[PDB]
Write a protein that binds this ligand. Structure first.
Ligand SMILES: O=P(O)(O)O[C@H]1[C@H](OP(=O)(O)O)[C@@H](OP(=O)(O)O)[C@H](OP(=O)(O)O)[C@@H](OP(=O)(O)O)[C@H]1OP(=O)(O)O
Length: 175
């Protein structure tokens, strides 16, 4: 899959500047590729520094949003309770307000997941690109496995877990 051309299309627009800066990372790759083309040694340290910064930022952003989503879920539990079957004790206003809150939280979680998946693709694609464009460079699988795969944005399965619950609530509430 063409990652760079599809990036705008796959970005949660409100968070655009917090995605992996694929465009800037590609210019660092191209610089290295040019040196190798000229028969010169490369210096991949500025690519990796920038890659690491991007990784820190992506993680830090995803984690903050995830902490937000959890706080939100707690506030909804405080108001409406811990299981969806409580909907039977709600009046029509309360039940509509609940539904609104649930749809918004689901939207936020879906967006968070997609942010995670697209950023992880981006790290995988940019390193693959470096490996393809620079001689005896073999970084993709090591970098992804050792630095990206341990981060919540990449490994998270809790958002999906919470999404199934929010959806179960939404269905229980519908009836
Ligand atoms: O999506 P675009 O901005 O048009 O970029 C493409 C695309 O790169 P991305 O998928 O990384 O965005 C191609 O990458 P592949 O998916 O084919 O590996 C790659 O094609 P070549 O590797 O055949 O050249 C080429 O990237 P680059 O220029 O880094 O090679 C690049 O096109 P331009 O950068 O030339 O626009």
């Amino acid at each position: 899959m063409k990652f760079g051309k599809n990036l705008p299309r796959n970005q949660v627009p409100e968070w655009a500047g917090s995605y992996i800066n694929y465009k800037g990372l590609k210019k660092l790759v191209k610089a290295a590729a040019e040196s190798a083309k000229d028969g010169q040694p490369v210096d991949l340290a500025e690519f990796f520094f920038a890659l690491d910064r991007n990784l820190e930022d992506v993680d830090s952003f995803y984690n903050k949003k995830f902490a937000d989503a959890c706080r939100r879920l707690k506030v909804l539990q405080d108001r409406y309770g811990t299981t969806p079957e409580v909907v039977v004790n709600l009046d029509d206003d309360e039940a509509e307000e609940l539904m609104g809150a649930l749809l918004e939280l689901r939207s936020q979680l879906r967006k968070l997941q997609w942010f995670g998946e697209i950023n992880r693709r981006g790290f995988i694609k940019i390193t693959k690109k470096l490996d393809k464009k620079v001689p005896n460079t073999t970084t993709q699988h090591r970098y992804i496995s050792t630095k990206v795969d341990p981060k919540p944005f990449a490994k998270d399965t809790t958002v999906a877990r919470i999404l199934t619950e929010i959806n179960r609530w939404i269905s229980v509430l519908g009836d």
